[PDB]
Design an enzyme around this catalytic site. Structure first.
Site, mmCIF file in Angstrom:
data_model
loop_
_atom_site.group_PDB
_atom_site.id
_atom_site.type_symbol
_atom_site.label_atom_id
_atom_site.label_comp_id
_atom_site.label_asym_id
_atom_site.label_seq_id
_atom_site.Cartn_x
_atom_site.Cartn_y
_atom_site.Cartn_z
ATOM 1 N N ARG A 56 -0.196 -9.724 13.426
ATOM 2 C CA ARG A 56 -0.834 -8.686 12.628
ATOM 3 C C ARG A 56 -1.721 -9.288 11.553
ATOM 4 N NH1 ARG A 56 0.599 -3.861 10.299
ATOM 5 N NH2 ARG A 56 2.823 -4.170 9.761
ATOM 6 N N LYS A 103 0.825 -1.202 0.000
ATOM 7 C CA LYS A 103 0.000 0.000 0.000
ATOM 8 C C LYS A 103 0.862 1.257 0.000
ATOM 9 C CE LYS A 103 -2.256 -1.253 3.620
ATOM 10 N NZ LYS A 103 -1.475 -2.493 3.723
ATOM 11 N N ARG A 112 -9.558 0.679 8.944
ATOM 12 C CA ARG A 112 -9.015 -0.635 9.196
ATOM 13 C C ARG A 112 -10.017 -1.545 9.896
ATOM 14 N NH1 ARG A 112 -3.052 0.054 9.030
ATOM 15 N NH2 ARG A 112 -2.240 -2.020 8.477
HETATM 16 N N1 LIG Z 1 -6.533 2.828 11.071
HETATM 17 C C1 LIG Z 1 -5.912 2.260 12.095
HETATM 18 N N2 LIG Z 1 -6.649 1.842 13.142
HETATM 19 C C2 LIG Z 1 -6.020 1.256 14.160
HETATM 20 N N3 LIG Z 1 -4.723 1.016 14.329
HETATM 21 C C3 LIG Z 1 -4.010 1.435 13.272
HETATM 22 C C4 LIG Z 1 -4.522 2.057 12.156
HETATM 23 N N4 LIG Z 1 -3.509 2.339 11.268
HETATM 24 C C5 LIG Z 1 -2.423 1.914 11.846
HETATM 25 N N5 LIG Z 1 -2.650 1.360 13.065
HETATM 26 C C6 LIG Z 1 -1.601 0.793 13.890
HETATM 27 O O1 LIG Z 1 -0.388 0.901 13.184
HETATM 28 C C7 LIG Z 1 0.175 -0.409 12.957
HETATM 29 C C8 LIG Z 1 0.908 -0.445 11.640
HETATM 30 O O2 LIG Z 1 0.118 0.190 10.620
HETATM 31 P P1 LIG Z 1 0.649 0.319 9.125
HETATM 32 O O3 LIG Z 1 1.807 1.218 9.052
HETATM 33 O O4 LIG Z 1 -0.444 0.739 8.233
HETATM 34 O O5 LIG Z 1 1.100 -1.157 8.723
HETATM 35 P P2 LIG Z 1 1.372 -1.724 7.249
HETATM 36 O O6 LIG Z 1 2.321 -0.769 6.720
HETATM 37 O O7 LIG Z 1 1.958 -3.063 7.341
HETATM 38 O O8 LIG Z 1 0.092 -1.725 6.521
HETATM 39 C C9 LIG Z 1 -1.023 -1.347 13.076
HETATM 40 O O9 LIG Z 1 -0.595 -2.665 13.364
HETATM 41 C C10 LIG Z 1 -1.822 -0.683 14.197
HETATM 42 O O10 LIG Z 1 -1.378 -0.992 15.495
HETATM 43 N N1 LIG Z 2 4.834 -5.250 -5.673
HETATM 44 C C1 LIG Z 2 5.758 -5.511 -4.761
HETATM 45 N N2 LIG Z 2 6.532 -6.606 -4.916
HETATM 46 C C2 LIG Z 2 7.463 -6.867 -3.997
HETATM 47 N N3 LIG Z 2 7.774 -6.185 -2.906
HETATM 48 C C3 LIG Z 2 7.002 -5.102 -2.781
HETATM 49 C C4 LIG Z 2 5.996 -4.706 -3.635
HETATM 50 N N4 LIG Z 2 5.410 -3.540 -3.183
HETATM 51 C C5 LIG Z 2 6.059 -3.258 -2.088
HETATM 52 N N5 LIG Z 2 7.029 -4.168 -1.780
HETATM 53 C C6 LIG Z 2 7.928 -4.124 -0.641
HETATM 54 O O1 LIG Z 2 7.398 -4.936 0.377
HETATM 55 C C7 LIG Z 2 7.273 -4.191 1.608
HETATM 56 C C8 LIG Z 2 5.820 -3.899 1.864
HETATM 57 O O2 LIG Z 2 5.409 -2.805 1.038
HETATM 58 P P1 LIG Z 2 4.603 -1.610 1.703
HETATM 59 O O3 LIG Z 2 4.167 -0.698 0.640
HETATM 60 O O4 LIG Z 2 5.326 -1.092 2.880
HETATM 61 O O5 LIG Z 2 3.307 -2.314 2.244
HETATM 62 P P2 LIG Z 2 2.206 -1.751 3.208
HETATM 63 O O6 LIG Z 2 2.195 -0.319 3.201
HETATM 64 O O7 LIG Z 2 1.107 -2.320 2.526
HETATM 65 O O8 LIG Z 2 2.365 -2.354 4.513
HETATM 66 C C9 LIG Z 2 8.181 -2.977 1.425
HETATM 67 O O9 LIG Z 2 9.499 -3.302 1.829
HETATM 68 C C10 LIG Z 2 8.098 -2.719 -0.074
HETATM 69 O O10 LIG Z 2 9.279 -2.112 -0.529
#
Ligand SMILES: Nc1ncnc2c1ncn2[C@@H]1O[C@H](COP(=O)(O)OP(=O)(O)O)[C@@H](O)[C@H]1O
Ligand SMILES: Nc1ncnc2c1ncn2[C@@H]1O[C@H](COP(=O)(O)OP(=O)(O)O)[C@@H](O)[C@H]1O
Ligand SMILES: [Mg+2]
Length: 214
Positions: free
Chosen positions: A167, A13, A88
């Site tokens: 998670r 994302k 979320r």
């Molecule tokens: N909209 C939300 N509601 C509740 N907790 C959230 C929300 N967004 C983020 N968090 C918190 O931040 C953590 C990491 O979020 P995020 O950066 O979006 O993870 P990822 O990058 O893997 O999608 C979640 O595991 C949660 O604890």
């Molecule tokens: N299409 C893809 N293929 C492989 N690795 C990816 C891709 N998109 C993102 N990544 C990598 O995988 C991890 C998760 O991406 P990220 O955008 O942080 O996810 P999110 O925000 O959903 O948690 C990061 O280290 C990113 O650089």
């Protein structure tokens, strides 16, 4: 334009949010980044959170909802924004309906559980800008360093394997219902809904999104 991106942690994302923000001028609103930064400063809304994130559990709905409401009140969001990690849970989505916040596009990243851990364990971030890297799949130009500022990249504390599995459970329980939620909203015409193959390489996912958003 207002956009929600849905998907498991590690689906891509944040990575794709950066390109959307650069082509179409709408800021990325990443509750995860805001929380991690509010944690850091510790002088604003969302300060209370490090222990919950570090467990891999969601922050409480009301707190996050407020944080987003304040965040989208800023002048840079007035023509559009990109929600990345919010809503979320069904309450957060219903609070958007309650608050009169329509969305034009909901973009679902399909990425199976089996790819998620390698992605998150290899993730490196530049916190000040939100730039995200992967040590193997999307590496910095210079190992360990942000491409733009040259600052040394960090690892998020919740990006450990054990935490990542909890998670993912939490994701399938509280957040995956959003897929059906916004599919129903789209069937009723209140948004455009699209599913993208988020297992493709970064540049291909990028191109598939460009073709949806025009
Ligand atoms: N909209 C939300 N509601 C509740 N907790 C959230 C929300 N967004 C983020 N968090 C918190 O931040 C953590 C990491 O979020 P995020 O950066 O979006 O993870 P990822 O990058 O893997 O999608 C979640 O595991 C949660 O604890
Ligand atoms: N299409 C893809 N293929 C492989 N690795 C990816 C891709 N998109 C993102 N990544 C990598 O995988 C991890 C998760 O991406 P990220 O955008 O942080 O996810 P999110 O925000 O959903 O948690 C990061 O280290 C990113 O650089
Ligand atoms: Mg992210």
């Amino acid at each position: 334009m207002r956009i929600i991106l849905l998907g498991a942690p590690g689906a891509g994302k944040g990575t794709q949010a950066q390109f959307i923000m650069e082509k179409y001028g709408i800021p990325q609103i990443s509750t995860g980044d805001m929380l991690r930064a509010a944690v850091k400063s510790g002088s604003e809304l969302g300060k209370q959170a490090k222990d919950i994130m570090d467990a891999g559990k969601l922050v409480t709905d009301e707190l996050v909802i407020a944080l987003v409401k304040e965040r989208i009140a800023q002048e840079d969001c007035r023509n559009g924004f990109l929600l990345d990690g919010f809503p979320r849970t069904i309450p957060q989505a219903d609070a958007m309906k309650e608050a009169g916040i329509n969305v034009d596009y909901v973009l679902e990243f399909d990425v199976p559980d089996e790819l998620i851990v390698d992605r998150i364990v290899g993730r490196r971030v530049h916190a000040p800008s939100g730039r995200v890297y992967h040590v193997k799949f999307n590496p910095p130009k210079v190992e360990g360093k942000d491409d733009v500022t040259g600052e040394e990249l960090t690892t998020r504390k919740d990006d450990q394997e054990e935490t990542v599995r909890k998670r993912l459970v939490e994701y399938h329980q509280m957040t995956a219902p959003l897929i059906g939620y916004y599919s129903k909203e789209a069937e009723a015409g209140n948004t455009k809904y699209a599913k993208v193959d988020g297992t493709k390489p970064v540049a291909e996912v990028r191109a598939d999104l460009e073709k949806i958003l025009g």
